[PDB]
Symmetry: D3
Subunit: 330 residues, 6 copies
């Protein structure tokens, strides 16, 4: 718990826009979501996506069992109506009395981007941004947002799985493995603008810390751009709700050709990653040199955790200071 408090300062995806619209016949929510073990409710009130604690101030019913009408989220129990700022603006039982100052629920940063809904629980450091997806607003590329997928594994373990190449021959032998490319090198890794940047051989990674990966592939078999954008919502201490968006230049083929392939890859990873125990990586794990990405990831996470304890300035420097290993200029 206290060991995860620094994560409240980042933007995390909690649902797709589609999920929010499908939740109830109004198409406006509400939708219950869970983020860092906090129970939240999401709704569209007018033009705004709003996120509140899923707990009415009156008698603690779940607002996610209520109703969106226009610019209000109405509690299902005694009909208190909450506005976009989390403030109750109608107590139907006392329509002429003034509403208690108490009658407000916590309201959090909530924004749509790339077709996902993002929530930032703590905006006090004012230095984190929604992760970078390189294919957004590139009109050469067709974009597909997959349905979210749930794993009984943590966001850290999911991230390390996605950025590891050592596992292809054993988890993905028929699907991703390459006899003639069967142990890619140790590569230089740069920190720039709160992202890890590193390239392989052609795979170009931009990883917005802590849990998002933007992978641009310049493909060998077709010579056309493919982008994978994967981000894990840390739902609680043992669970992730994971999102994949993918973009492609050659878009004459079926979206489901790629969805089925992505789903096959995830199905091969899933049971092995869910088997890792304890859920959080303990100190006794044994790294080797080929674990560079994982080793550097864990080091930066540890530094961000320390810097959060020191405060806004220290956190901003730990996240945003550049640290360059490569020949590249940014």
């Amino acid at each position: 718990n206290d060991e995860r408090e620094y994560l409240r300062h980042f933007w995390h995806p909690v649902c797709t826009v589609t999920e929010l619209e499908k939740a109830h016949p109004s198409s406006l929510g509400p939708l219950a979501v869970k983020l860092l073990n906090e129970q939240l409710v999401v709704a569209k009130l007018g033009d705004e996506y709003v996120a509140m604690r899923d707990r009415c101030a009156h008698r603690s019913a779940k607002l996610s069992l209520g109703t969106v009408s226009g610019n209000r989220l109405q509690c299902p129990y005694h009909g208190w109506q909450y506005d976009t700022h989390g403030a109750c603006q109608l107590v139907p039982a006392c329509p002429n009395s003034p509403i208690p100052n108490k009658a407000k629920v916590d309201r959090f940063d909530c924004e749509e981007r790339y077709g996902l809904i993002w929530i930032r629980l703590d905006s006090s450091f004012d230095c984190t941004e929604i992760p970078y997806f390189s294919a957004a607003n590139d009109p050469r590329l067709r974009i597909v947002i997959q349905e979210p997928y749930w794993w009984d594994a943590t966001a850290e373990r999911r991230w390390e799985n996605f950025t590891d190449f050592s596992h292809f021959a054993f988890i993905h032998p028929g699907t991703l493995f390459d006899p003639n490319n069967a142990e890619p090198p140790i590569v230089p890794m740069d920190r720039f603008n709160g992202q890890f940047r590193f390239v392989y051989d052609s795979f170009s990674y931009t990883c917005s810390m802590p849990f998002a990966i933007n992978l641009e592939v310049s493909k060998y078999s077709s010579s056309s751009l493919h982008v994978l954008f994967n981000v894990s919502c840390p739902v609680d201490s043992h669970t992730t709700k994971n999102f994949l968006i993918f973009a492609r230049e050659q878009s004459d083929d079926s979206d489901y050709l790629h969805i089925a392939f992505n789903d096959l890859v995830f199905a091969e990873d899933k049971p092995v990653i869910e088997s890792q125990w304890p859920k959080d990586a303990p100190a006794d794990e044994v790294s080797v040199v080929a674990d560079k990405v994982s080793i550097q990831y864990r080091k930066w996470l540890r530094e961000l955790k320390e810097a959060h304890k020191e405060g806004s300035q220290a956190f901003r420097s730990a996240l945003l200071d550049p640290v360059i290993e490569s020949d590249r200029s940014y």
Copy 2:
């Protein structure tokens, strides 16, 4: 936790007589029941309903898997037989040896009333009685005992739901909400003989503390008496087993007209009440003036809990001293 110790001093219903008779083909029980997280067993031993701890003194098997033999409860494992006082009177393997002095299980005050079985776990204060049901022994009324219904909510939250009128428009708009009588005002509430008494003008409540509600309705659409008796068994920290008995003066219609209607009402309340979290109301809940019944209820429970810590005489005064604010003469 220790919050609930004072509740052990009250009589709580644990099952209907019908449930006890259906439990075992003999119609005498035994039946396993749970009350304030205690595992108990109820059986008809001779002319008496008896409650014991559901745990044999010999090797801890559940007596509820056993059988009533004569006027005794026989354990299923090695056949020890327990009398109405929880004392072992036969050890089949050693029929002539003396029975160990410790060969006994705790028993508890247990009585049938109104077709329910009631248990009081702690009788040491000796000032509580079985709640009041006004329709009992009224020849003019047909009485129907419904099957128990289980909620994932506490008895306090269930009580507050049953006595609140604010929620009709939102939970019961098609079934109970009167669009010409939305808000009855604050009414005076009296404490008398360990009951809350209050009237609307016609709904007359007599609420035997802590969890029983007797509601006499002098109906408007029929000019005839209807009585609802609702009481919650606090099974554990997050569960209630709830009992509804209803009585009616005009009794030539179908029982199932009313049962179906009550069931529909409970089905409307249930998911909202079960969503309330945390399960016990914290101090941060925000009341409005329309919540008088709930406010006064919580106040009295707090007083009973503090008086229990001060001992038998303090508790008896907190429970039984009158506090009148209406002009009714009792």
Copy 3:
């Protein structure tokens, strides 16, 4: 928790050889097993059955999801290969670097006997042996290994059920209760070589402490030998995986006549034993003279628990010193 640590010094069955061979198409395992709440993996590497902690040293994946490859157990994630001593001998991603000294997993004693796989978690006292089954090596007898049966009950409670005669009239009245022979006397019990030995007149028990029972019956209905070997794996604090092997001299009949009878007896015991609570017998249980076997059993277990605290030679003495009550010579 610490009350059970002394049980780690004994050999416990964890699966049948059949279960191991059925686990994976290779017939070599791996198979996940759980013993005293430890997650272990069993595999056949060459001619050896091996047992390791089910947790890779690299990134903590379960080895039980991996593959046997010759004399090695290969992790499913990045293919680290472990030898019969639990030491990693191949890191495929770094195939010529020195393997970290840390790259080892805990390896436990593991042996086949009687068609079961046995594990001893702690071999430090070097004085325990796999329990004795008298029918092994006897060409006169046909041996049948039943499928394991799981109970929600501890190994101590299961052992006391199997060696008690008092319960027949109440649990097994149609099946084992002899109405003309309804109370076998208290018999002398010998401790010899870490076994309880006692005889009823014809039932000869050799009970390898703590959880195995070898029962030799010279039957009253055939003049033929029948052996029952029952042993309970203590899977965790509330669960047993139980094994029955039986042997018989007159073997021209169907194995399933006997299997169905054993299963019927176990089904009659099961719900009563599973109801016993709390799972471990508290000090408050009330014994009678007929309970001699379980009284003496509990005494010896407590002696073994005390001696374990005192260290290796106290434990050896408590386990293996003779204590003779009968007129028999050993």
Copy 4:
């Protein structure tokens, strides 16, 4: 198919009044029922129970999915309203046009008696009555109507099972088999008023043809009257919906003592009777002298089948002519 047409002339129970009142929240129905493979709908219109073909004349929707509205059954599709004679009296889409003469559905005899709803599909022979239940109107007796029980067996096979004593030692050895009274003799059987009447010494049968059995027991264990009334609804060619009403003079005990016993007896019979094949008894079945009751039953049924072909007065004579074997006077 045509072999069963004569059964349409009798009254058959189709549901309990309780089932009808529970079907729909209004307590008035409608309820879908099936009798001799006809799909019917039952409803309470005013003070009358009505039974119609469950098929609207307009577009063939099921009226059982509709609503009772005063003295009318309203179709769910376009709201045509049917009166107690099955005639449409309102076409909402054409509220002042003349209603087509075709706008009528078949209406069948429907009456409540003993707490069951009875239907007679063909009243043309005007000689059948609702079966006789002797305990009705008797203030000395407490009456209990059990929930209906469904069997995969025909009404004839169920009737022959209920009136056979030969099967007790094999189906009911623990439950009804009297080892000292193991073969009741052949008894004289009288036909009187469309009933078989026969007596065993104390068991007095009055069997209203074809499917109802009234059994009056003067018990050997109390000197008290016990009545069993069993009747089978022939739902289709292989299914029965069966009804048991029982009455007892000594009524201070639990209803559920008796219900559980009846249910245990029925559960013992059920799989054997359901196994009988083909469902209707072929001519090749081999009778013995002990089968007198079922031999005479089969003879009378065949007589009724022959007489139905001959028309109304032959059937009346076959049903109601007396045929006396005993010394009794009627």
Copy 5:
């Protein structure tokens, strides 16, 4: 069967393009579908959508269990490869022998349009076209293809339900009914170009015979165009697979607002339509004047059925001859 043969001459939708692409990871099919009780397989071979009988010529395995590679559908059993014309072009067991002339399966007209796959089983009359959807290629309108929905009702009964207004007050009271528009008139109906054309008050219907409905609504509440395109696949004698495509001018709102509404309407219709029995409308159904659309629909279907028996010219005239009742010119 013979009574449905005329339907083989029309184009019927059998799946969405999305369903075909999702069926297997190739994204090319194959997909099993059923049309007029014929088992068919659909695949994308190169650029073409192809439909064949789902039955290999060799040993009658289902081609729908096989694999699409490029321009071939490979049988799962012995790998015979079929081309876009249904001809086997590779017998892997006899790669040098010539392929039997027998080695071909029936191939049917198969075309994508509007995002659905359409099949015409009989092209011999050469005068039927894929039904008309007015919103196709109108760039003012956003188009949404719903997931198909299955009903246990025939295409005729589904069509008549969709074009009836009489049922709103009873099936759709809260969702479509209008007190102040509560019985729309009898309207003129034109036959033109194989479509029924009729308008209401503003609802404009173009119904391509036999099973498609294109409804253009000029809405009262928003003054913007909404188009509903509903077509029923006659899967067999009692089943429809139904498709809804809808288009809207005001497309700033959520697609799921409309999907949820359409799904609610269908859920209200579904149980009533599925209750209609027999599945095909028999002669005894009673029409009233307000049934004009249904009456005229059944008349044209009957004429098409007669004309099919007479041949191509007669069928073409029955389908395509104009029959004008309205003031309109086409």
Copy 6:
């Protein structure tokens, strides 16, 4: 239908001996089985396995719900006892009366062989014998009888699947397909003693007509003998109960290595074979030269079916006359 009458003249396996012993706790049966749509019962009566029609002569209950008593099969309903010839020898209700002459049920030739129970429904031609299994009574071979496996396919289609090599690349590419030995040629096939005999160079088939296959493999990868014996029970027109027995010379490996492999092979075949439709091969199937085994099999079955219509001597010649085309000397 009448197509299958000739199959009644052959011996078919109906269950394993293990299945019979497991059916009832006595280990003697009875066990219900179905063969060519006949409902039969098998029991061990004394030293004999007996098959009767599963239908009591008295009131048609299933004898398979009864019990073996001594050397008789006792009906569950009224306890009639049937001897090994199907004759009733005890009528409990009339123990002294003469037993009706018709109190008997049909019995059928029934024998154990190889650990299976075989039944021949029609013994009148008296020229068929139980199929040949070459490994029986060979000391060098360990024999494993697998559990039966059920397919929704006919015995003919299952036989043709088992003897076809064409399908390996497509159904079994990972498990059986040899990429260097795809096509063995047409081989000569001999008819001898009612068996098909044919050899590949090493696979030697002896196929006892109609449904049994004995395959002797002189393996290449081990230089040791492996025998597969597969036989299908034609349960009804669309179902088979299939039996696999396998024998091996090198028998120090795990039985479950082989069982798992066989099960994987059957799992690969099963959905393709079950998809073949219609269930019986019609005349429109297209054979190629590689189908010789299947072509010759169907030819011989057609001859047996025609010879059966001509009578006992014609059938005996069709079945037993030799037809040699190899140069082997028998």
